[PDB]
Amino acid sequence: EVQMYFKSNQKLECENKCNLLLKLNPNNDLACLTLAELLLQKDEYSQAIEQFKKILQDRPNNYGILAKLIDFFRRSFQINEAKTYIERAEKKATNTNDPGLCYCRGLYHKYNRSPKDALNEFSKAKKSSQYAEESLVNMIDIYLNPDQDLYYSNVEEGPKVVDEVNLRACESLLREMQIRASYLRYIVMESYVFFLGGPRYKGGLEQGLKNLNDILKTNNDYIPAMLALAVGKFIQKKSTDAKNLLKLLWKRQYTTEYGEDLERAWLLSADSFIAIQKYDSAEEILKKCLKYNQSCGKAEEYMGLIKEKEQSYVDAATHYEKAYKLTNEKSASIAFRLSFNYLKAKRYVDCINICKKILVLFPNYPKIEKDCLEKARQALK
Amino acid sequence: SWDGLYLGFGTMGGIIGIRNRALEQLAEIQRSFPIWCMDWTPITPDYQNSVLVVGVWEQSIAHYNIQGQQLGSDKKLTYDPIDINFSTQGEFLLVSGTNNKCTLYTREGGFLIDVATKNDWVWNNKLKPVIKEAGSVAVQDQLHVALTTNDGEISM
Amino acid sequence: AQEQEVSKVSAPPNQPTVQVQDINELQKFTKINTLPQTEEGVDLSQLMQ
């Protein structure tokens, strides 16, 4: 009945059925998810955070609102009070290994640049009827995209292939979610596996293309289908058709259900704009992405690169520094770019600190000590 | 030097030179890293010998004799030193540099405490000398340090 | 000089290195014996949980 009322798009009687479920089973997941969805419907951005925090204070677990708040805090680079909130919710969670709490912890750890514990928590939380599809999508995204970047980079190559057992794990997760998760997501995710499987079959990409074409024939709205099609046409050296699809992706208005994919598409579109001299549309797309998100990694790196190319060193240095803070002291290329920008801006102390830390981390970089470290060291006094 | 006889200078090219009051090449030592901070150990009735303490930029602190022969200490450090100061009577050693921390050490090299962390490079840190009367009695537990940083703070 | 040598000879690992040998096994073991499961139509991935 709750599913039917959610499909009928009427909040009152659906909320009544959710109240009946709460009176029946306090540990219901679908009712909490529907209540969170209706709360998002009534209030989105005006004061939704305040009421969500109030409801979290009122009810100890409140897993759906907790997950939405975790997503918001990821969007607002404020993960510290997010981890305080998950701790205070876990203190009175009765049982540690609840599916909702485990899923929230896995999502938090995935958003904190840590794939191992996030994968472990997602696998632990998969043992339930609900959250199975989202958790499986999260583990397979982690397996395929560890650094959370654009799938196909026009700068060089674009596909990423790691060992062989990652594909085996992806296949196991696919055969699990073909009986657990939905069908369209199964088609899209098998298409991703085929596209990123490389020359292992030489036929997975074409059958994925046929499946996606059939999907668009049946349903031309499903965002992951067109996103997979655009990725595949990037793979197949198509130029006009790929930009046509990305353009027709752009015209669609922002839907709350499929925001992330849209952002990703925008990023891909932005890359298509940065490969050519058209930097104005690229910076427009980047400013839109930074308006709709505050934790993107590649977008700010591209913005810093554009600003550095336009010899605006202060803003480029700021963007590169924020990007380096986002990926916590692990990347090396953007560290070298930041060091070069600091050297060119007469900030030798910060450049020397960056060079020292990058040399401590990776001792196999002979290019960086003689290029900027020595010059700054001699220019100190 | 505290005896008023010797003089020590360092170069960013790694050359440390020890001369006399006549400015002659008494001793020359060549290194591979820039030279920033040097000092002379204060005279002491227990030790009565003066050595040159120089902090190199390869995360090391070195003790050199008058003839130029190293004493072999070559104590390693986590951070590159910037400034070095010996307390009166040669009891303490105030070390600053990278990590934005001002630390205290014994003359042997034992860590005791860290004075302050400013969150920026400390260019110059100095100790307050004390004057001891003939046969005076005092604990002299109090110590005073003055720090100067890169942003423009002179703290006490 | 003798202290370091004797300590290295004995070196009772108290807390820090009791069993610290953490290396990814979810992918290392799937190299060892998982291929025979994969070519055939057998799903035992639940059973290895």
Is the minimum CB–CB distance between A257 and chain C shorter than 8 Å?
Answer: no
Is the minimum CB–CB distance between B34 and chain A shorter than 8 Å?
Answer: yes
**Which one-letter DSSP state was computed for residue B70?**
B
- CA distances in angstroms from A42 to A35, A48, A76, B35, listed in the order given: 11, 9, 21, 67
Q: Establish whether chain C is in contact with chain B, requiring a minimum of 3 CB pairs below 8 angstroms.
A: no
Strand, coil or helix: what is B134? coil
Contact C31 A169 (CB under 8 A): no
Report chain A residues whose CB lies below 8 A from the CB of C43. Answer: 172, 175
**Experimental method used, please?**
cryo-EM
Q: Would you say how long chain B is, in residues?
A: 156
Strand, coil or helix: what is B146? strand
* Chains interfacing with A (3 or more CB pairs < 8 Å): B, C
DSSP string, B103-123: EEEESS--EEEEEEE-SS-EE
Contacts (Cβ under 8 Å, ≥6 apart) of A9: none
What are the structure tokens assigned to A10, written together?
A: 């009427």
| Contact between B92 and B86 (Cβ < 8 Å) | yes
Contact C45 A176 (CB under 8 A): yes
Strand partners, B81: B97
The strands making up B81-86's β-sheet, listed across from edge to edge, are B81-86, B92-97, B101-106, B111-117
What is the distance between the terminal CA atoms of chain C, rounded to a whole angstrom? Answer: 50
| Contact between B6 and B50 (Cβ < 8 Å) | yes
**Which one-letter DSSP state was computed for residue B43?**
P
Q: Which of A295, A232, A230, A215 is nearest to A260 (CA)?
A: A295
What are the structure tokens assigned to B51, written together?
A: 């050595």
Is the minimum CB–CB distance between B124 and chain A shorter than 8 Å?
Answer: no
Report chain A residues whose CB lies below 8 A from the CB of B57. Answer: 377
- Rounded CA gap, B98 and B103, in Å? 11
| Contact between B7 and B19 (Cβ < 8 Å) | yes
What are the structure tokens assigned to A298, written together?
A: 């590649």
Q: How far is A284 from chain C (nearest CA, A)?
A: 42
CA-based angle A318:A292:A119, to the nearest 5?
90
Q: Establish whether chain B is in contact with chain A, requiring a minimum of 3 CB pairs below 8 angstroms.
A: yes
Q: Which of B60, B66, B75 is nearest to B28 (CA)?
A: B66
Q: Which residue of C has its CA nearest to A175?
A: C43
**Which one-letter DSSP state was computed for residue B98?**
G
Question: What is the number of CB-based contacts under 8 A between chain A and chain C?
Answer: 19
Contacts (Cβ under 8 Å, ≥6 apart) of A106: A117, A118, A119, A120, A121, A122, A124, A125, A135, A138
* Chains interfacing with B (3 or more CB pairs < 8 Å): A
Strand partners, B150: none
Contact A381 B150 (CB under 8 A): no
Q: Establish whether chain A is in contact with chain C, requiring a minimum of 3 CB pairs below 8 angstroms.
A: yes
Resolution of this entry, Å? 4.7
Residue A190: exposure state from Cβ atoms within 10 A (0-12, 13-18, ≥19): buried
Strand, coil or helix: what is A162? coil
Contact A381 B98 (CB under 8 A): no
- Residue A349: which of B12, B57, B150 has the nearest Cβ? B150
Contacts (Cβ under 8 Å, ≥6 apart) of B133: none
What are the structure tokens assigned to B86, written together?
A: 């010996």
Q: How far is B133 from chain A (nearest CA, A)?
A: 42
Report chain A residues whose CB lies below 8 A from the CB of C33. Answer: none
One-letter amino acid for residue C14 of the chain: N
Determine which of B11, B12, B82 to mutate to test the interface with A (most A C-beta atoms within 10 Å).
B12
CA-based angle A56:A2:A4, to the nearest 5?
140
State the residue for tokens 């060089």: A156
Is the minimum CB–CB distance between A175 and chain C shorter than 8 Å?
Answer: yes
